């Protein structure tokens, strides 16, 4: 990419989910959901593979015409209240549509068909972006208008997400589609508790990125897209291994790792709501999630698959490091619940 | 406008009905994606006239030129689609199952 | 290092390209008389000669430079090659895949130091006449038609990245001749060589590498008599007017990519490790780790260049 | 339309079965309806007729588990007496339990089905007589 | 008792369950189309749910 | 939430108000926690890169035990804020509105009638 | 809203026109500016939640100086009866509606 | 005359109902244009003019005759499909049947359609002795009062560029 190109368009690519989050006239919130959806399809086609093209032309079918639901929910308040933007007034299916459309950018319960698929042909690095810095755009618009939105369907996206998620992710064996699959799963919790308390979603957001951006430049840093390639990682580099082994159980709830705090907290704020019968349901099928994430562990660090002799090749030649972010992100995230109570 | 804003709002759903039940050519979409927009634009620019909300002329056009290049975007992964495949046919578009 | 901000800031491999910044890579037979020619042909035009590349191309470019043991050089034998054909253990597949590696890790190591010095490069037999080989030893019994299928396998999935070579000065020395002269030549094990291996090799030679990359690359075949005098085919090298080939659109903002690639060794051979499980190929959990733990325990491999204290590294407290 | 299937609850349970049975049978077929759009939508069929026979029998077999559960929980009620009896819906429970074993012809489905939908049936009697709420309103 | 029944039961069923409830929801066309699809009947249910509940 | 408050600064890390607070203790263990697992990361990106663990980088071991802390001193610093406005926030609402917050009254153990279950 | 970079740097790209109230171009008012004002200098510094039920009397007015709906039915009510009665012959325009003309 | 903005806004539905029931591709063009002179003129009825015309400038002849373009190039023939485009005719003009009695159905439903309020409210208002008040001043804001919608613009089409020469690259 002509280094010029590659500015413009990661400039947008950042400026569309700032321009979402600073603005209040919602229309200024849809142009920095454009500017996203436009940005982010070049890079998506780099290699310009046959896979590549499909997953463009998808991802950019599905965003756009959530696109247009949410401008026509803009469209409509236009003539219900002559504001730009949402009011407590609001008619009830004026939210809704917001909250389906955004919904679907971002991927959560029955739109989640999109996203396992684009993040299997994207690369890895496009990957992480399309998972983590393009959540955060839809997820700024439904927190700021969350005092409005329905307790019933988030709800309901954020039950079924996180069966879907959890579901798919048992059969996949590609990583790419088991953290697109994590990634649906973690967004239903954080839906969850939008309507009772958004700063929680923020923080089941935050930990979410501070383990899945670590989790992907692991599984880049040997570019694995296999568990049986990440499972020769003892071999490529012994010492990711252990942190690896802990980053996954901390995506899943296990109680000594950073990631209990979000889902404990969550159960929490549900309980304090009554929402005793739902928090229940999520609790449990999350720990089908753990099951899948142990699976892999299994492949990549309690036991050691059979390696390939060109392998020692590879180990001969010095391994082009890891970036610092990976132990920043590592360490911040596989243990800082000593620390939760001001976290939250 | 009352039941003038019923006609276009149901070209719209109409017009959503079409994006989401595809069928062969992929064109036909992207040509679907567009009619909404048309409704949309039509729409914003009505009631602002009827508001003599003059403020907010800006964006019934704003609506449109966002909306071309989306548009812009969408072709050019249409293209690249019949340089890949010698179709636009979506069918073509199932490998990443 | 080198990256896009060097990139930015001038180093670009443009700018640092001449007359003989080329890639000339000789292919022959068993014995074609091969090195001979590219180590004059690169003196000739100024230009690195790459030796060809063995089992332990690697380890020589790799720290010490001393040659590894057999089985940290992952337990390939040309010499049991020869001597057991079709063995139980497959040495010769293990040896075949090794060799494609060392000449991967051997064409990227060229093409770094093509685009950083702007240096030509010759590399005798290359990773695009590599497969000639392989196609003798499916022909024979040496290998089986899934091995053949691990290698090509490998070779799509890596090959295809790096550009090709821009000319491949060759010499076609028959089998009758070739065998002859393995005979006359010491090695005990070379001259067990069996003539149709000659044959199947010098065939995958004619019949698919020269026609195959003389339409994506001028070709220039001498025979025997020809290249005992380089100065002859150097006239023609200089001659050739590299026309042709995908080299043509490498600008200096495709080549800083390219650069990147071959500056990163890991990645180079990173399909060359895939995880498909053919016997021959696998080290298995229990060898493979001890292996290992031998292999980087060795002096100044238990740490990263310049870490490691044994072999005299200091300031690693500050590094 | 929707005054209609809360009617179920109105009237105490155990009486007036006809009417439960009835609402019971309708959400199951509205659920089938659902399933087989999805069943249909996505793994489509290969000819019109064929899918058309699925999303009946989709809609069959969910009517059926509505009925007998309907069925057997009201007269359960009424047999037993026990107005309201967690029991009496788990006997239901099982029974749609049953009833969707023997549509899929597997005893086997029939003793998943039986213990879970059994249970998830009883919860619900539990739910409506504790007073549990679901999808509540943030009252924080 | 052990072994079989109490491992057929509690243990091995809900390994079952699941196996196939993935194994149906994962089998996916891959084809837009019919993705697409399930996008309307959602839209269409989610309606509903505003409208009934109005 | 919180935001919405009356005075709240729109985009402000701490604000002043939070003067009045009492700074944290340097050696707070949290800062401490802080710093540890700092030198951890630290340790952790010598290993990943495979450096001599301990020996080396002693200039990075210490940025990192240096910048965890001193982020901690002043995350802390607010987020010790946050939860102060919280009860400033909170227990002036149980005043203002009295009615609804009424301190009932407890009766001795003697009259209260605890029904007792045997266990036998 | 998400992150106020606007408040804070104290620019005001984005909320002078969020109202059909807010600066119209020449000053030309819009149309439901009688009644927007009176519905949010009410509704500042109570919150929504108390914005919802107190100042219901400005919303409902300015839910129908834009909508305008109840005069819609109001009138509309009004033409059927027209209708009916100029049925039995009962109403005849006035030629009012063809009076003389005010200047 | 009166029904002058119902008529238009009904054809605009067919127009979109064409579309939706997705004929030919190029067709289908053809119809996305028929809908959009319906519609510039709807806009071009409630006394907006600027807005309207630039339908026509932008996207009658700008957009669409891209859409047509590469409706050329890309989208084959629809070929051995051609078929259908006449059983899409008739179930659009069908369809089109169906809504007229529809519309008269919800008429019914006097609980909008304001069947004897038609020509009562394409306009609402208007500042009779005004002079200054013509669509177009407004969408001038955009230069001075509103320059954001103007700035974030301005870097779509920039960036569409980079972005579009990256994509077909
Ligand atoms: C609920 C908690 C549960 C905890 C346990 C479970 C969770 C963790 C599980 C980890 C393993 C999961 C499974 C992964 C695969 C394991 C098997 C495997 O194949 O590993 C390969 C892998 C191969 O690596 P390698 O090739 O040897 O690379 C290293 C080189 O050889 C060079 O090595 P070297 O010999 O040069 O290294 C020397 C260095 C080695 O240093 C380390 O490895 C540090 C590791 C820290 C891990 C922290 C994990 C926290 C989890 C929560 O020495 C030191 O730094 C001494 C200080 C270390 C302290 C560690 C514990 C501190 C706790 C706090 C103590 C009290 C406070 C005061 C401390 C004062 C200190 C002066 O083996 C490992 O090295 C494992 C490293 C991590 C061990 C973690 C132990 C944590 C115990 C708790
Ligand atoms: C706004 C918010 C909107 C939210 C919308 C949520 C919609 C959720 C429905 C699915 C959404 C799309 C999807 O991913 O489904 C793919 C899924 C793919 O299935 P397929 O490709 O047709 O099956 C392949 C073979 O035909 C499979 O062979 P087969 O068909 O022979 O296997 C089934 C066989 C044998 O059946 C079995 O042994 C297993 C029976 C399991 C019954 C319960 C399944 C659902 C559990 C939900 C918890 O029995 C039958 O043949 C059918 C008999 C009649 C059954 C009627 C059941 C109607 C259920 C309606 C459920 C509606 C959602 C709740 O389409 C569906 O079947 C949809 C219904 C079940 C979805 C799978 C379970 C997902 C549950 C997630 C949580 C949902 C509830 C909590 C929230
Ligand atoms: C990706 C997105 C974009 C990138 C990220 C952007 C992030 C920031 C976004 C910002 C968005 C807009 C924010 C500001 C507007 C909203 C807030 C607000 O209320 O401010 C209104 C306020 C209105 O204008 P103003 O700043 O008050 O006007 C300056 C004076 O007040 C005027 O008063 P004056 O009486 O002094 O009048 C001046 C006149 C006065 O003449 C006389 O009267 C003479 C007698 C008196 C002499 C003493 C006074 C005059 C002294 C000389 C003039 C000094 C002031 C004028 C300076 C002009 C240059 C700043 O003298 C002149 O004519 C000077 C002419 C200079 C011509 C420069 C031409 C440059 C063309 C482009 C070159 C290549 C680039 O700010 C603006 O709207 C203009 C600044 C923003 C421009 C648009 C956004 C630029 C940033 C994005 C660029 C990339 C776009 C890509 C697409
Ligand atoms: C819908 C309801 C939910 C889904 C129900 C069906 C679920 C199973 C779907 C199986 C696959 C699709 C075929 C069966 C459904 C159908 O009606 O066709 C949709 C149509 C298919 O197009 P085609 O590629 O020709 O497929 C023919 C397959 N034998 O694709 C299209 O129609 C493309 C155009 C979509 C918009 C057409 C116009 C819609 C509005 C028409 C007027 C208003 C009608 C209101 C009712
Ligand atoms: C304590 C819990 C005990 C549950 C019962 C334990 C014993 C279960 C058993 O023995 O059967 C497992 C079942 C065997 O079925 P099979 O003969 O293989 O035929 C399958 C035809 N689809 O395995 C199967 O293959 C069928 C599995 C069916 C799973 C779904 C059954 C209904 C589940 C309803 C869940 C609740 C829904 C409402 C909420
Ligand atoms: C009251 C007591 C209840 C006890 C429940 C025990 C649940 C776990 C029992 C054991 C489940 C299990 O072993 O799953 C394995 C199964 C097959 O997969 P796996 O074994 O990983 O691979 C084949 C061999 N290489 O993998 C599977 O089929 C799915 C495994 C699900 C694991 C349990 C999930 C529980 C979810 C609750 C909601
Ligand atoms: N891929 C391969 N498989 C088997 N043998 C190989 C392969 N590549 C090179 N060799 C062997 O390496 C030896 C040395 O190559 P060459 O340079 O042609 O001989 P010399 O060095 O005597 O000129 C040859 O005898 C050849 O058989």
Not at chain 2, 77 to 88: H, I
Not at chain 4, 23 to 51: K, R, W
Not at chain 4, 81 to 89: F, Q, V, W
Not at chain 8, 110 to 124: R, S
């Amino acid at each position: 990419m002509n280094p010029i190109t590659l500015a413009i368009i990661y400039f947008t690519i950042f400026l569309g989910p700032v321009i979402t989050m600073s603005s209040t006239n919602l229309m200024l919130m849809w142009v920095g959901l454009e500017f996203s959806l436009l940005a982010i399809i070049p890079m998506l086609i780099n290699k310009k593979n046959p896979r590549s093209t499909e997953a463009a032309t998808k991802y950019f079918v599905t965003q756009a015409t959530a696109s247009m639901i949410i401008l026509l929910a803009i469209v409509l308040n236009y003539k219900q209240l002559g504001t730009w933007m949402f009011q407590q007034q609001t008619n009830g299916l004026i939210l809704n549509m917001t909250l389906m459309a955004l919904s679907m950018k971002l991927g959560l319960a029955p739109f989640h068909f999109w996203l396992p698929e684009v993040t299997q042909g994207i690369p890895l690095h496009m990957g992480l972006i399309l998972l983590t810095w393009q959540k955060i755009a839809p997820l700024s618009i439904l927190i700021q208008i969350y005092p409005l939105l329905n307790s019933t369907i988030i709800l309901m996206l954020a039950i079924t997400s996180i069966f879907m998620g959890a579901w798919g992710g048992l059969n996949q064996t590609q990583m790419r589609k088991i953290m697109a699959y994590s990634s649906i799963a973690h967004m239903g919790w954080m839906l969850a508790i939008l309507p009772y308390n958004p700063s929680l979603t923020l923080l089941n957001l935050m930990i979410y990125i501070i383990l899945t951006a670590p989790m992907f430049m692991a599984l880049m840093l040997n570019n694995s897209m296999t568990i049986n390639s990440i499972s020769l990682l003892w071999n490529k580099t012994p010492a990711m291994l252990t942190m690896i082994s802990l980053m996954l159980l901390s995506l899943g709830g296990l109680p000594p790792l950073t990631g209990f705090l979000p889902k404990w907290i969550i159960i929490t704020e549900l309980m304090k709501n009554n929402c005793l019968i739902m928090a229940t349901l999520m609790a449990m099928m999350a720990l089908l999630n753990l099951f899948f994430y142990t699976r892999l562990i299994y492949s990549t660090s309690l036991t050691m698959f059979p390696t390939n002799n060109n392998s020692k090749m590879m180990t001969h030649q010095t391994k082009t490091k890891p970036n610092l972010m990976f132990s920043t992100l590592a360490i911040m995230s596989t243990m800082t619940l000593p620390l939760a109570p001001q976290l939250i | 406008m009352p039941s003038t804003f019923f006609n276009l709002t149901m070209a719209f759903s109409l017009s959503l009905l079409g994006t989401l039940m595809f069928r062969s050519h992929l064109m036909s979409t992207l040509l679907c994606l567009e009619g909404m927009v048309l409704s949309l634009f039509i729409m914003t620019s009505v009631t602002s006239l009827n508001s003599n909300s003059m403020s907010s002329m800006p964006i019934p056009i704003t609506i449109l030129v966002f909306a071309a290049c989306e548009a812009a975007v969408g072709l050019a992964l249409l293209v690249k689609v019949s340089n890949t495949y010698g179709t636009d046919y979506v069918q073509n578009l199932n490998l990443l199952q | 290092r080198y990256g896009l901000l060097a990139a930015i800031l001038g180093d670009k491999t443009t700018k640092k390209l001449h007359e003989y910044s080329r890639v000339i890579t000789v292919d022959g037979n068993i014995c074609s008389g091969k090195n001979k020619l590219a180590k004059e042909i690169a003196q000739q035009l100024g230009m690195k000669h790459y030796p060809e590349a063995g089992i332990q191309y690697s380890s020589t470019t790799t720290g010490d430079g001393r040659p590894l043991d057999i089985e940290f050089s992952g337990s390939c034998s040309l010499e049991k090659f020869y001597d057991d054909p079709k063995s139980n253990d497959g040495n010769s597949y293990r040896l075949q895949s090794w060799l494609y590696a060392s000449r991967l890790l051997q064409y990227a190591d060229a093409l770094e130091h093509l685009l950083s010095t702007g240096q030509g490069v010759v590399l005798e037999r290359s990773i695009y006449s590599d497969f000639v080989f392989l196609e003798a030893m499916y022909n024979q019994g040496y290998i089986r038609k899934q091995c053949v299928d691990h290698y090509n396998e490998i070779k799509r999935l890596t090959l295809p990245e790096y550009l090709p070579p821009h000319a491949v000065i060759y010499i076609d020395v028959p089998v009758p001749e070739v065998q002859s002269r393995i005979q006359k030549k010491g090695d005990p094990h070379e001259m067990k060589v069996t003539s149709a291996y000659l044959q199947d090799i010098e065939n995958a030679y004619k019949k698919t590498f020269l026609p195959k990359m003389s339409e994506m690359c001028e070709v220039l075949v001498y025979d025997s008599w020809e290249a005992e005098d380089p100065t002859k085919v150097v006239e023609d090298i200089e001659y050739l007017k590299y026309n042709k080939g995908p080299w043509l659109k490498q600008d200096d903002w495709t080549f800083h990519y390219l650069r990147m690639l071959v500056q990163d060794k890991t990645e180079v051979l990173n399909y060359t490790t895939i995880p498909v499980y053919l016997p021959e190929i696998t080290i298995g959990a229990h060898q493979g780790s001890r292996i290992y733990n031998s292999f980087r325990e060795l002096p100044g491999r238990k740490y990263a260049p310049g870490y490691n204290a044994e072999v005299g590294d200091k300031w690693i407290w500050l590094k | 339309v929707k005054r209609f299937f809360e009617s179920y609850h109105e009237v105490p349970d155990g009486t007036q079965c006809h009417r439960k049975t009835y609402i019971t049978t309708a959400l199951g077929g509205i659920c089938g309806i659902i399933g087989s759009a999805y069943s249909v939508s996505l793994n489509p069929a290969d000819s019109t007729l064929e899918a058309v026979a699925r999303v009946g029998r989709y809609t069959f077999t969910a009517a059926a588990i509505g009925a007998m559960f309907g069925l057997t929980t009201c007269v359960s009620a009424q047999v037993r007496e026990k107005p309201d009896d967690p029991l009496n819906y788990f006997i239901g429970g099982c029974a749609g339990g049953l009833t969707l074993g023997a549509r899929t012809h597997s005893y086997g489905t029939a003793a998943m089905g039986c213990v879970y939908m059994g249970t998830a049936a009883a919860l619900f009697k539990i739910g409506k007589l504790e007073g549990w709420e679901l999808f509540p309103t943030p009252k924080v | 008792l052990d072994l079989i029944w109490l491992e057929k039961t509690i243990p091995k069923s809900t390994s079952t369950l699941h196996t196939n409830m993935t194994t149906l929801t994962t089998n996916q066309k891959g084809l837009i189309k019919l993705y697409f699809m399930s996008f309307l009947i959602n839209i269409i249910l989610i309606i509903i749910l505003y409208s009934i509940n109005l | 939430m919180m935001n919405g408050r009356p005075g709240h600064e729109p985009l402000k890390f701490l604000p002043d108000e939070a003067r009045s607070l009492p700074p944290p203790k340097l050696n707070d263990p949290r800062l401490v926690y802080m710093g540890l697992l700092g030198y951890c990361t630290g340790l952790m990106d010598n290993m990943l890169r495979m450096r001599p663990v301990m020996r080396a980088g002693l200039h990075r071991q210490l940025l990192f035990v240096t910048s965890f802390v001193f982020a901690g001193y002043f995350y802390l610093k607010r987020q010790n804020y946050l939860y102060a406005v919280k009860d400033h926030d909170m227990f002036g609402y149980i005043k203002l509105h009295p009615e609804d917050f009424p301190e009932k009254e407890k009766k001795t153990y003697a009259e209260i009638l605890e029904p007792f279950h045997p266990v036998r | 809203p998400f992150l106020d970079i606007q408040k804070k740097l104290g620019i005001s790209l984005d909320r002078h026109f969020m109202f059909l109230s807010a600066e119209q171009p020449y000053k030309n008012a819009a149309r439901c500016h009688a009644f927007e004002k009176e519905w949010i200098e009410c509704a500042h510094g109570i919150g929504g939640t108390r914005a919802k039920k107190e100042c219901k009397i400005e919303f409902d007015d300015f839910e129908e100086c834009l909508l305008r709906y109840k005069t819609m039915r109001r009138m509309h009510d009004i033409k059927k009866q027209r209708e009916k009665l100029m049925k039995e012959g009962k109403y005849t325009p006035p030629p009012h509606h063809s009076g003389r003309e005010e200047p | 005359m009166n029904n002058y903005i119902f008529v238009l806004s009904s054809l605009f539905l067919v127009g979109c109902l064409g579309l939706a029931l997705k004929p030919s591709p190029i067709y289908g063009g053809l119809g996305l244009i028929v809908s959009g002179f319906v519609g510039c003129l709807m806009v071009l009825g409630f006394g907006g003019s600027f807005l309207g015309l630039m339908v026509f400038l932008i996207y009658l002849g700008g957009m669409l005759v891209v859409f047509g373009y590469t409706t050329a190039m890309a989208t084959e023939e629809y070929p051995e499909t051609w078929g259908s485009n006449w059983l899409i005719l008739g179930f659009l003009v069908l369809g089109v049947i169906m809504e007229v009695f529809l519309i008269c159905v919800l008429n019914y439903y006097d609980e909008v359609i304001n069947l004897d309020g038609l020509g009562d409210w394409l306009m609402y208002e208007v500042d009779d002795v005004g002079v200054m008040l013509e669509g177009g001043i407004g969408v001038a804001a955009m230069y001075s009062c509103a320059t954001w919608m103007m700035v974030v613009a301005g870097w779509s089409l920039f960036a569409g560029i980079f972005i579009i020469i990256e994509i077909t690259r």
